[PDB]
C-alpha cells in the first residue's frame, strides 16, 4: 500500500552542500583506466606545507623573493611580516592560496630563509616572533624579549624558523575586514645581530630568499570562497 | 542518496478517519496525573446496557415514564413499542442516544417493567414480541402466538423481558428513511391478562415504569453522526 | 523501483517544534574545543533554586530587597506575598524569570529571610502560609491557624521558610489573566510575634532581606513565551 508522507517545508530546495548524491543517468560506465599515473595527492594540506616565496618590496617598490643585508646592523628590522595568512607579503605563497579557501587555521608556520650571499660572507641574524598585546617590537631589545632564534651563516645555507601557534582561541581566522584578536597574531621580524662580514672582492649586498609554509601540526578547515578579484 | 517516490493521486488530502497520527508539536509532556480517579469506563456498550426510561403518552399527549392499568382487561394492548432503535418511545433512552451514533446493531433488547401500584394490588400481564411479516397483533389471541412471557405481580416488583434477536440479516439498521425489512423488526405489546385486582381504599390506577437497554449479547458498530436537530 | 507515497494534507508546513532535524550544509566540522570550561549547567531548574531578591515597597513606593521591623508588634503583617509565580513582589527573582517561560509548576517554594539588624538586636517573627478559600488572614490569630514557623533571632542570621505545595491540582499555572483556583494559592505573611528588642545606641529600624527560590521538589514544565514588554 502507498506510504503516507509529510512533505517538509523546504520542498524543492537545491542544497549545494547536501552530503547526499543525485540520480545517475549514464551508469555502468568504466572510468578510463589511469593506474599508470604518478604524482597523486589526496590532502590539500600537503600543498600548504611546501615552502613558497614571500613578496618583499624593492627599493623601487617592486616585489622580489628576497631581502638585502650588508656590512652593518640597522637599529630597525630588515623585514617585518605580520602573522596572518592574510599578510600581503605572503599573498602569493601556496600556503596563502590554499588558506584563502578555508575559514580557519591552527598550528605552526614555517618561515624559511636561504642565504644567497657568497661563500666568503659571514654574519648572524636574530629572527623574532612577537605575540600581540604590546604592539610591534621597536628595538632589538624588545624583539629579544619574545620568541627568537639566532641564525648563524656557514656551511648550511638555510634556516627553518617556526612561528609557534600561540593563541587565546583554538583556531584563528584566515582573513578579516578589520584586525581582531582572532585574525591577527603578532609579527615576525628579522634583525641583523652582527653585520654581514666579508673579504675584499665580494659584493656588499647579500640576498636572503624568504619562503613560508605550514608546519608539521598545521591544519585548515571549513571550505569557503575568497573575495573575488579581476586577474591582472 | 535520495529515494525516488511516486506521489499518489490523492496528495494533500485530509482524511478525517485515517488510522494514522500526525506531528507532535509539544512532546515530552506529562499528562497531569489522574490515578486517584474512579468511574472510568472504556466501552460505550456499557451505557447501552443501563436501563433508562421510555416515553409513554399521557391522556393529554404529554410524555411520562409509565403506563396505567386498572381493574379491567382491555381487548387492546396497554402499550405498543415497535422494535427499532428508532422508535419514538425510546428516543431519549441511553440505548437510543448511543445507537444514534452507530449504523447497525445485533443482539438482545431488554424491556424492564417496574410495578409501582400498592402492595395490595395484584394482577397479570402478557408481554408479547411479535416478529414482522403478518402485521401488528390485533388481539390477545394473536399476541400469544408469538414470543411472550406472563408477568405476575407480587413480592418482586419488576419484570425483565427480552426481545430475542430474530432477523433475516446478521445486523440491523439503527435508523431509516422508510421502514425496511432490515430496520424495523416487529412489535412489543403488553396486554392485561387478568385485571389489576385490589381491596378497598386503594387507588384504581396503577403505574408501571417502562425502561429499555441492550441485552447481554447486544452490540453496535460503525460510528456515524445522526441527523442534526435544534435543541428545545 | 520508485516507492508510492501519500502526500499528507500538511505538505510544506514548517513546524517550529517538530522533534526532528533538518539538512546539514556544512558537516564534518569540529566544534571549537571547550574542554577547559567551567560553570556549565544543564537544567534550568538549577537557576530556580538559587535564592534571589523580592521587591518590597519603600515608604516612598520605591522597591527595596528588605522590610523594616522595630520595637513594636503591629496588629497587621509586616509583609504579605501572594503565592503565585506571578506575584509582583517576586517579578524580578530568578525563580519568576524562569517560571515566566514555563506554563506550570509543582512543588515547594523557599522564602529566605536574612536578619540584618545589629548583633545586639533580638526578636521573634511568625511566618505564616495561609491556603486560600477563606481569604487573607486578618489577624495574628488567623495567621496562626495555618502553616507557620516562628523565627527567633540569634547567632544564625537567616530563616529558610517553605511554602508547602498544597493544591487541588497536581500542577499550577505560573501566570493568569484573572486569578483562578489553579493559579493563585494563598498568602505568605510575616508577623512580629515579639517586638524587636535592643539596648541603647542601636538604630530603631532593622532590615530583613527577603529572597525566594524553588524548593527541593520544585519543578516547571511546558516551555512558552511570556507576554512581551518594552524594557525601561
Amino acid at each position: 500500500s502507498p506510504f503516507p508522507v509529510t512533505v517538509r517545508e523546504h520542498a524543492g530546495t537545491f542544497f549545494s552542500t547536501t552530503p547526499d548524491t543525485t540520480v545517475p543517468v549514464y551508469g555502468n560506465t568504466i572510468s578510463t583506466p589511469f593506474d599508470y599515473m604518478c604524482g597523486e595527492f589526496t590532502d590539500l594540506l600537503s600543498l600548504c606545507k611546501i615552502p613558497t616565496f614571500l613578496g618583499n618590496l624593492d627599493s623601487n617598490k617592486k616585489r622580489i623573493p628576497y631581502f638585502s643585508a650588508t656590512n652593518s646592523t640597522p637599529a630597525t628590522p630588515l623585514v617585518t611580516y605580520q602573522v596572518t595568512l592574510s599578510c600581503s607579503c605572503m599573498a602569493n605563497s601556496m600556503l596563502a592560496a590554499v588558506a584563502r579557501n578555508f575559514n580557519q587555521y591552527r598550528g605552526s608556520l614555517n618561515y624559511l630563509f636561504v642565504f644567497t650571499g657568497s661563500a666568503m660572507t659571514k654574519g648572524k641574524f636574530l629572527i623574532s616572533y612577537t605575540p600581540p598585546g604590546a604592539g610591534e617590537p621597536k628595538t632589538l631589545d624588545q624583539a629579544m624579549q619574545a620568541t627568537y632564534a639566532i641564525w648563524d651563516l656557514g656551511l648550511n645555507s638555510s634556516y627553518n624558523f617556526t612561528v609557534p601557534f600561540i593563541s587565546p582561541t583554538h583556531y584563528r581566522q584566515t582573513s578579516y575586514n578589520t584586525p581582531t584578536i582572532t585574525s591577527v597574531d603578532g609579527w615576525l621580524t628579522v634583525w641583523q645581530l652582527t653585520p654581514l662580514t666579508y673579504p675584499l672582492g665580494v659584493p656588499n649586498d647579500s640576498h636572503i630568499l624568504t619562503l613560508v609554509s605550514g608546519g608539521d601540526d598545521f591544519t585548515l578547515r571549513m571550505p569557503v570562497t575568497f573575495t573575488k578579484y579581476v586577474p591582472q | 542518496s535520495p529515494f525516488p517516490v511516486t506521489v499518489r493521486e490523492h496528495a494533500g488530502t485530509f482524511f478525517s478517519t485515517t488510522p494514522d497520527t500526525t506531528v507532535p508539536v509539544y512532546g515530552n509532556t506529562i499528562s497531569t496525573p489522574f490515578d486517584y480517579m474512579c468511574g472510568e469506563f472504556t466501552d460505550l456498550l456499557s451505557l447501552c446496557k443501563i436501563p433508562t426510561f421510555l416515553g409513554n403518552l399521557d391522556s393529554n399527549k404529554k410524555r411520562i415514564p409509565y403506563f396505567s392499568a386498572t381493574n379491567s382487561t382491555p381487548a387492546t394492548p396497554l402499550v405498543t413499542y415497535q422494535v427499532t432503535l428508532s422508535c419514538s418511545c425510546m428516543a431519549n433512552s441511553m440505548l437510543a442516544a448511543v445507537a444514534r451514533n452507530f449504523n447497525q446493531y445485533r443482539g438482545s433488547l431488554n424491556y424492564l417493567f417496574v410495578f409501582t401500584g400498592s402492595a395490595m394490588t395484584k394482577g397479570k400481564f402478557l408481554i408479547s414480541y411479535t416478529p414482522p411479516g403478518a402485521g401488528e397483533p390485533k388481539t390477545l389471541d394473536q399476541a400469544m402466538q408469538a414470543t411472550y412471557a406472563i408477568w405476575d405481580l407480587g413480592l418482586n416488583s419488576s419484570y425483565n423481558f427480552t426481545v430475542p434477536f430474530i432477523s433475516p440479516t446478521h445486523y440491523r439498521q439503527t435508523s431509516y428513511n422508510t421502514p425496511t425489512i432490515t430496520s424495523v423488526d416487529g412489535w412489543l405489546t403488553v396486554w392485561q391478562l387478568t385485571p389489576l385486582t385490589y381491596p378497598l381504599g386503594v387507588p384504581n390506577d396503577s403505574h408501571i415504569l417502562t425502561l429499555v437497554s441492550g441485552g447481554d449479547d447486544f452490540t453496535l458498530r460503525m460510528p456515524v453522526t445522526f441527523t442534526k436537530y435544534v435543541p428545545q | 523501483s520508485p516507492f508510492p507515497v501519500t502526500v499528507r494534507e500538511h505538505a510544506g508546513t514548517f513546524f517550529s517544534t517538530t522533534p526532528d532535524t533538518t539538512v546539514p550544509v556544512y558537516g564534518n566540522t569540529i566544534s571549537t574545543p571547550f574542554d577547559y570550561m567551567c560553570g556549565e549547567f544543564t537544567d534550568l531548574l538549577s537557576l530556580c533554586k538559587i535564592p534571589t531578591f523580592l521587591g518590597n515597597l519603600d515608604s516612598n513606593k520605591k522597591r527595596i530587597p528588605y522590610f523594616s521591623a522595630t520595637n513594636s508588634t503591629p496588629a497587621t503583617p509586616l509583609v504579605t506575598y501572594q503565592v503565585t509565580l506571578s506575584c509582583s513582589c517576586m517579578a524580578n527573582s530568578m525563580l519568576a524569570a524562569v517560571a515566566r517561560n514555563f506554563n506550570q509548576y509543582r512543588g515547594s517554594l523557599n522564602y529566605l529571610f536574612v536578619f540584618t539588624g545589629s548583633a545586639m538586636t533580638k526578636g521573634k517573627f511568625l511566618i505564616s502560609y495561609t491556603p486560600p478559600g477563606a481569604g487573607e488572614p486578618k489577624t495574628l490569630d488567623q495567621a496562626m491557624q495555618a502553616t507557620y514557623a516562628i523565627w527567633d533571632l540569634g547567632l544564625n542570621s537567616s530563616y529558610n521558610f517553605t511554602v508547602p505545595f498544597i493544591s487541588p491540582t497536581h500542577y499550577r499555572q505560573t501566570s493568569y489573566n484573572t486569578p483562578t483556583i489553579t493559579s493563585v494559592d494563598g498568602w505568605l505573611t510575616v508577623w512580629q510575634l515579639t517586638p524587636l528588642t535592643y539596648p541603647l545606641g542601636v538604630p530603631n529600624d532593622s532590615h530583613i532581606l527577603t529572597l525566594v527560590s524553588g524548593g527541593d521538589d520544585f519543578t516547571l514544565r511546558m516551555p512558552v513565551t511570556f507576554t512581551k514588554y518594552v524594557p525601561q
Partner: peptide, 24 residues
C-alpha cells in the same frame, strides 16, 4: 568526502559511480 548518509545508496555502486578499473 562529503557523504554522510547512513542508509546505503539506492542506486547500485556501478551505476551511482563510474567503475574504476586497472588496465594492468
Amino acid at each position: 568526502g562529503n557523504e554522510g548518509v547512513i542508509i546505503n545508496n539506492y542506486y547500485s555502486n556501478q551505476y551511482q559511480n563510474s567503475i574504476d578499473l586497472s588496465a594492468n
